[PDB]
Design a protein around this ligand. Sequence first.
Ligand SMILES: [Mg+2]
Ligand SMILES: [Zn+2]
Ligand SMILES: [Zn+2]
Ligand SMILES: [Zn+2]
Lengths: 186, 209, 149, 50, 123, 189, 241, 295, 50, 107, 97, 298
Amino acid sequence: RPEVIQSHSIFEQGPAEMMKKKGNWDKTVDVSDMGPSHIINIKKEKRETDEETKQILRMLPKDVSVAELLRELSLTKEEELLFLQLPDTLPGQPPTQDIAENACTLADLTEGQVGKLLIRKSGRVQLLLGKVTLDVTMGTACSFLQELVSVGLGDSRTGEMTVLGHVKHKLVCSPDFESLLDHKHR
Amino acid sequence: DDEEETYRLWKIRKTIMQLCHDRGYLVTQDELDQTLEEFKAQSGDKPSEGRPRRTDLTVLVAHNDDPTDQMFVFFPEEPKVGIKTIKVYCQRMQEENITRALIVVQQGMTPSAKQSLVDMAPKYILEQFLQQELLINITEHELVPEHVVMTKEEVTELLARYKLRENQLPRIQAGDPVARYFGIKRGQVVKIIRPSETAGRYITYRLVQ
Amino acid sequence: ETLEALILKELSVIRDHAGSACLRELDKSNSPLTMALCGSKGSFINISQMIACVGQQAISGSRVPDGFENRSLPHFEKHSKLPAAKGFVANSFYSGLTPTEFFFHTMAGREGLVDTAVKTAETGYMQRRLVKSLEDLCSQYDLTVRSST
Amino acid sequence: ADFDGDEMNLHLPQTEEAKAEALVLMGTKANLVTPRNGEPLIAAIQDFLT
Amino acid sequence: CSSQTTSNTSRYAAALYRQGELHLTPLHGILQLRPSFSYLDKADAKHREREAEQARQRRVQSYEFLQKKHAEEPWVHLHYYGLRDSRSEHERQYLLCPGSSGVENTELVKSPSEYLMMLMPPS
Amino acid sequence: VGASVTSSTHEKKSRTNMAVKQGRFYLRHNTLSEDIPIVIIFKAMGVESDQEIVQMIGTEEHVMAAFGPSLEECQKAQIFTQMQALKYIGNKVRRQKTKIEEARELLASTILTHVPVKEFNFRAKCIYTAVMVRRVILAQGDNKVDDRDYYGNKRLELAGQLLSLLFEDLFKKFNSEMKKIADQVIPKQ
Amino acid sequence: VIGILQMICKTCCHIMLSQEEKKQFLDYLKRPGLTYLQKRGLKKKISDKCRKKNICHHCGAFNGTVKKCGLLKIIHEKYKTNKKVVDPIVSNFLQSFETAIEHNKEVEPLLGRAQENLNPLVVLNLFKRIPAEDVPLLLMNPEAGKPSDLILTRLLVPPLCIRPSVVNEDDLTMKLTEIIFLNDVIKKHRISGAKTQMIMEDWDFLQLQCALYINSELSGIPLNMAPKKWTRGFVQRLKGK
Amino acid sequence: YISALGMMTRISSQFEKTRKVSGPRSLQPSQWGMLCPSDTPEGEACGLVKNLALMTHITTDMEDGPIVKLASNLGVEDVNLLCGEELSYPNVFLVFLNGNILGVIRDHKKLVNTFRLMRRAGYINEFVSISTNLTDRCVYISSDGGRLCRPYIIVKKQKPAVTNKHMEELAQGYRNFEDFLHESLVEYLDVNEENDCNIALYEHTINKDTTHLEIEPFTLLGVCAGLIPYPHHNQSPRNTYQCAMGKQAMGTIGYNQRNRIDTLMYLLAYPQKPMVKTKTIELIEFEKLPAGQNA
Amino acid sequence: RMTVGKLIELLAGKAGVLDGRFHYGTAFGGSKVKDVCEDLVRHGYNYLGK
Amino acid sequence: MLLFCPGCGNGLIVEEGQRCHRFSCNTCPYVHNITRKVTNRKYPKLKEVDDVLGGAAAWENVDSTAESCPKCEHPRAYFMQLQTRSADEPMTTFYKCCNAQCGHRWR
Amino acid sequence: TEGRSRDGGLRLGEMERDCLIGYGASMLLLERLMISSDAFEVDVCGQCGLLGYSGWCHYCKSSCHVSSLRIPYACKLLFQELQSMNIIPRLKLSKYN
Amino acid sequence: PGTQMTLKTFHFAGVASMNITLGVPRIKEIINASKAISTPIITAQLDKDDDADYARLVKGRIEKTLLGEISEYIEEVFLPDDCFILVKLSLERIRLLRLEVNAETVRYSICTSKLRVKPGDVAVHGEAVVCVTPRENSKSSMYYVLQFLKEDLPKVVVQGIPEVSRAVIHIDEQSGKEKYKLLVEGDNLRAVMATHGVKGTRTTSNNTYEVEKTLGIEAARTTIINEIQYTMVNHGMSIDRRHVMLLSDLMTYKGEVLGITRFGLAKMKESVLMLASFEKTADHLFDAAYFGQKDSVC
Ligand SMILES: [Mg+2]
Ligand SMILES: [Zn+2]
Ligand SMILES: [Zn+2]
Ligand SMILES: [Zn+2]
């Protein structure tokens, strides 16, 4: 091992370093795309973060309920799948179900128009439902795959399964508590 | 580089030579005040100089009492001195017919030779110093009062004065850096002259164990 | 730290000058002044605190650390750094302290009591070891000093 | 001492040798100066200085 | 393999967007899927086989008891149809419930003063 | 640095820790023989997917950069299935089908007990442990140690709350003796 | 006791040294002004210089390391197998367990754990034969005593003047009473010719009580007979604030 | 008398002088208005034995039923419906109840506001506290008893909730304390919740932000320390020593003191009541059983 | 010791006795020395106690 | 930076067993050959280079310009600077003065 | 004794013991700590160097080599317990010239 | 005086930094003469103080400097045929540091305790970049060993003398003459004076053990006295020098420095009863009887 060393500190050529590098790592052999060596560009590995699954190329944004629904209506007009959550109990009451105060669930109502959604100035969003209104808020974001499916139990021995589409967004409902207290003081 | 190593070589030569003078061996004053440029004049640059030989010195003799008593100074090159090298040194010593010799190590020296370094012969003894230590002569350090060795008659008179038995005096360890500097053996005595807070001085004596 | 160094320097300047001013105003034949000058009881700090201004309270030689999240007490804004919030005191003992100054003052004061309590044991242990180690020696008639041996 | 309610011990030796020894080495008149550095301890205190 | 998330799925709803109108459907269940790893266990089992007045009952708390309980229920096999299949678009029609655009719903008669006391019953 | 929780409820007081002795994270509790690398516990609960672990802990560059080392040792080990991890913990069980179920039950009922679990669906317990790791890793960014003097973390007992326990104990003891006497007397006397 | 039994040859109860070395140490001990700290230093020196010798130069006997095999239990590692060539001594020793292996099947798996165990009778009857000239090398003042009195077989009892009528009686009185009680029962019960295992267990319990009669601070006792309260041993009343 | 009364409020400590750590002895700003600043025994116990302030409360265990039910509606999201990556965003917050995890929420601010509005109205027991923590992105809820409380006047839009009319009504005897609690005029806070407030010490210092207001600052000091006149004109140790020396004065014990037989009892022949008295002296009736003579 | 608390107590007491008033010494409050001084001078003692 | 299998979500290692190095899984036969280059490391760790050139070291790093003190301005404290911790971590500049019997060293 | 209900008498704690050494006095601390605290007398047999009683050495069955000596009681108690542990201090004495 | 200690503030020589042990803990640490102590300080004098020659740089030549920023970026170099590990140098910035490190010096530095990486395994392609080649060790080691090979930027083991740190401001008021000095935090006295270019003869340390080991007992006792007198004066009380002179004279008379501890006392003193009177009272007796020693009473 060499003991006598004379170091250097005069300004070196940065381009010389960059060219040394270039000659050391830029001698591409990517033309070796042989049979055992193809890679499907859709079949890469992935990042720890879904939002940036782009470590090698070929060579989430903030939003609000009013903006998303306005975008949905305006820039496109096809059909979308939405997943949403309601308050534990709906404002209605059981429809002649002979009742413990069982919660009025969506599953226990007849079909047809159930209400309206209203968007106000300043972008505030509410849901009109009978004599009351429920608040709506954009849920926690999602980045991993969610698939909507319908399971057909056509027979006790076997059935059928057909896909319907993927889910992109979530919505959260809420009671407007302060409105309830203002309507009914305590 | 090749300038710092030469500076080291000049410094170690200066300090070791000072120690030789202090122990009282033969030495020439003109070499005491040898300059670094003088060292370059008398010895070439580091790349042209050979460590294991160039500095070897044996001119000093005990002219103080016996000019015929030659002494030898060696400077190995390897970071850790090996058994074969000390065997070469000991055969060269036997050829020269001397009693003792000094060895300067760069970084260390092998454990088997560590063990051998105590039992070569009753008539022969060897003394090893680190390059790092020798770089500075402790005798000149501000925190080291002057030590002086004295003859047996002086200790006789001293022990007679205070009515003491020799084993009552304060001790000084054999491995003490100053004790190593003076190369004194067990059972000798050392005078110290502590520089007072004022013009006065206090004398105290220590025994080497 | 620079800001701390500046603030403490400025607060210290405040207390010195105010106290100075009071001693100029102070009349001869005053009692505290008389007791201070001859040194029987007091010091010029005490007559300054009673009359002019109680200085910056210090805990471990530093301003009072935050106790809640990013403040000393809820009565002050988050990350507040004005002198009053970090423990300075502006009222004298003659004119009385306010609730927040009084609390900070107590915080500083209790450290003295705690220190005196802690001192008890360690110092005695040191002394006991030391006198034990040294007790034997004596000064002989020869002017030497010798152990028992 | 501080006269705010402290207490103090008293001993009486039972020999003539010990009497003489306590008076000579330990007396007050022979202990005006502390051995740490030789300064006087037994001096006037508050309200005599004033 | 699938792992269930929650027992009650009433409060959740799936809705499909359409221009000027929204259609909602209750979910029968939400489930989460994972890649299976049991084949390593099968390999390990193959390697192993190649190598070679009762006390108060507490089985209610033992894992294999639940495994046995699940094992009682028979399997069913399902035919599959991907989203590319127009069968999916045929099934899609079921989402848009027919009816008049403006309907006065019979239910939801409770006024807000009531609504507070149903979702917050007396303590 | 390290983290711990005093998991205490009406039944018993228990306590779990974490260690960063080497840089890799280990889980440590008194009834096992020695501390165990954390990824093993995670797999044993049923989060075997490495992606699932790293997503659970976090996505930001420094957090998983620092977390990285705590799994290499595991892939040196052959712990690739829930069964393998559970067997390993079984071998490390200590006492004052042992190989399989005893470890499963011990995990489910004695580790972070205050977190409830019923059907062996450990998901709630996984999330909690993931929070516990993220706290300690990020705690090294700034030395904001939780001072134990903040009076928000103190609780005061009282006369009744004390005497409740003592009567509890005495009543249990009274019943157990009645039980003991009942067994001894009737069948033989 | 363990120091000395590690410095003694079991075959012939001699100190394992060469004559030149023996003379060298004897010269060291001759030196005048021997000091207590020097005694400690030379105790360490002799321990180090004699532990190196693995065979008895006087009779060629190979002896193993003696080690504390358990709490208040000592064993001699003479009959130890080694990773190197199997020693003839262990080769002849191990083969002697044939009858035990035949009768009981747990002997064979642990036939190699059989070593030379040491007990007060064996030890005492070994040191009673020690030549006198070895005693000074063992840092024993022969006027102070001899190795046989080092192992105890008889105990004093302190005079009443140091124990009050009420500590009801002092722990010492209770300790002495329980020791004698055990002594009487064990003698008559061994005269009854009972089982081996529990006779020696009584022996161990006796030894344990004697140990506690000196020192009350021992904490190695198993759980199932661990003491449940503090008691004052001699060291407790001599030491402490 | 002061000795017996003071003792009832004494607080011990489990640390029990094990060793020196320079820890609990120091006074901490988190005691503000819960424990007396001056009343701590001198000596080695300094800072390990403490006493309560004049106006304080201790809480007890609650139902835990309604609290989770309410939370389940305000948009708390269940953990087990989502994967692990969600904890990493800068906009979700973890909701804890009694140190047990409850769910993931977005827009925490709205949840806290509604919860506080709900508690004031009366649907959640007043001794339930909810506070936010920004650094770790969590919001805590607790219901276990044993923690400490204080009543503060509410402040909204730079005006106090309580008005002169109310004080006249209370003086006339129309209303009582519980009324102020129900009308959402005053509410209990704790150490964990007052970390997220801005108390106003007096009227003049109210500003845009302040949410609450102190009922009376002089209620910081405990019972024993109420005896000092002008306690805020003294150096601090001088206040501490008096607390630990008014426990020993010789006074009167009670009206049955003549019938009692007791191990040791000191009475004072001709006691007198003070001529400069605190208000606490009135509240604890001290001047009915005096302990000194005007020199 | 800086117990200005006691120097105020004595003045307030003195001014209270001379007209049957009890005074207050509340923490962070109490009668102000300013007003008490005027009440002394109404009775003829020096307005600062000495 | 970590790599994981699309097929099984587990960490990927790099190996060579053919003409070209590949990322591969140790649980499933997924493999991805690396025909090109990537530019992000794990930021490795070696300790502080303090005294490799201690004392009166090589003279090649002489420089012309230097600052001066505000007090005495004697001729001997020519500039130096140094670094704090790591590649993305900052640098720090200090000024130190050493004749005798003092302690001066500015930041 | 110690208490005030019982009789008392204060303690010469170890700090005072150093104080008395410090001045350089010698009879004072002897008096304070042996004459007036636990003064006591015993006898010993010079031949065997161990204590006996009443000028009769029970060990030696003789009365010739016996002698009397003054010694603090606590020290005597120390010799007994140490002998009780078989740690025999065989003390050696001579004329007091 | 230790009893009189009040633990006064603003003892940081007027800069609120350089936190060295002081007070009763400091006196304790001297008396115990522990071979290891907290917050050691060493000091040196070069030749001259102020502005523009021969003095400053040496400080950067010996204090803490991580490999760190000398590489502006650290990034991978994979290539289908193989991969290696490379480090860039910030040469322009190194001249800003003006420490004389360079590609060859670091190349010499590596292979020191670094998994026996051979010189051939490391190559220099330019003064700005150096690279190292992986290898398999087979001791829990494979081709993927890279992860453990990540041993280059802040912390594994390094070239130079370790156990050094940084010192800070200490101004003076006595401007009548120009006087300035270099402080060093660390516990290696021997090497720091062994450096080329330093007035070694006037270097000092506050580590009592270090001076003894390197200079001798006379140097040791002079440090003991200096430290006690210094510590005492800072706290404001006064002790005549003769008292400390005797303390150090006793502490350092047997040949080596001995702390006033149970171990030390047992070393110096011999009496069985005295030792049993102070500490470890329950152990010596059995030993003493074992040696059968006879003791005087003096
Ligand atoms: Mg007093
Ligand atoms: Zn033999
Ligand atoms: Zn895999
Ligand atoms: Zn006799």
